[PDB]
């Protein structure tokens, strides 16, 4: 018999992004080919199968620095980190291959799906 | 020129609630008249003006235990903590006064608004 506030999840995500922009309570640095990205472990886990696996590991859960595979493109990661905190994906002709490869590595199934669809339309 | 995934914010919140239910990466205990509630500081801040103020304080941000005012009802807090992680509010005739008072103290404006409206309809 609950009532539901339609905008609650969006408002929560908007506030989490405000915390990220002001570097409030960020608890991890993600290193991508020497570029560094500060974030909240819980948000990374909520968006990515890879971060979910990493931060549920009894040893890795306590790390303050995570280094991604050197093949990962920093711009592709940046675009995906922005998507995690906003639901908005900056998908462009020039970045779609790097975004799809990064989303496959991060295990972000819905992003992989839209990249596959956008690539298929151009062929 | 971004595209947007409609269900992303809801899916993020659902995963954050899964983490709460399994007590994964919870970093604070909220004490309410001896009842204890584990949660994520970032989620509490994203939902409540009071927790936002508390965890942005340079001393309180580092506390692992927060004690609420003794007038706060544990059931009213529990219902609001559930709402924070799900967008669902269990508002009932028997709890509406405790839920509204707790939402006013926690500074959860949209919850206060629906409680005022539901009370006004019964008068």
């Amino acid at each position: 018999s609950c009532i539901q506030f339609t905008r609650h999840a969006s408002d929560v995500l908007l506030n989490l992004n405000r915390l990220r922009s002001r570097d409030i309570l960020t608890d991890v640095v993600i290193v991508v080919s020497r570029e560094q990205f500060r974030a909240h472990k819980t948000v990374l886990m909520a968006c990515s199968g890879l971060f979910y696996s990493i931060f549920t590991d009894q040893l890795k859960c306590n790390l303050s620095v995570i280094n991604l595979d050197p093949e990962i493109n920093p711009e592709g990661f940046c675009i995906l980190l922005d998507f995690m905190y906003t639901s908005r994906l900056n998908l462009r002709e020039g970045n779609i291959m790097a975004v799809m490869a990064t989303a496959m590595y991060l295990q972000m199934e819905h992003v992989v799906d839209t990249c596959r669809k956008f690539i298929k339309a151009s062929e | 020129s971004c595209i947007q995934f409609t269900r992303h914010a809801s899916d993020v919140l659902l995963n954050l609630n899964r983490l709460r239910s399994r007590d994964i990466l919870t970093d604070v205990v909220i004490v309410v008249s001896r009842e204890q509630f584990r949660a994520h500081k970032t989620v509490l801040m994203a939902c409540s003006g009071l927790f936002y103020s508390i965890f942005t304080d340079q001393l309180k941000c580092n506390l692992s235990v927060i004690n609420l005012d003794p007038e706060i009802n544990p059931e009213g807090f529990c219902i609001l903590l559930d709402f924070m992680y799900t967008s669902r509010l269990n508002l009932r005739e028997g709890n509406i006064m405790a839920v509204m008072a707790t939402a006013m103290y926690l500074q959860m404006e949209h919850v206060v608004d629906t409680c005022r409206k539901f009370i006004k309809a019964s008068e």
Binding site: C2, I3, Q4, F5, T6 | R88, L89, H110, T114
Partner: peptide, 4 residues
Amino acid sequence: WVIP
């Protein structure tokens, strides 16, 4: 607010 809605009935979910």
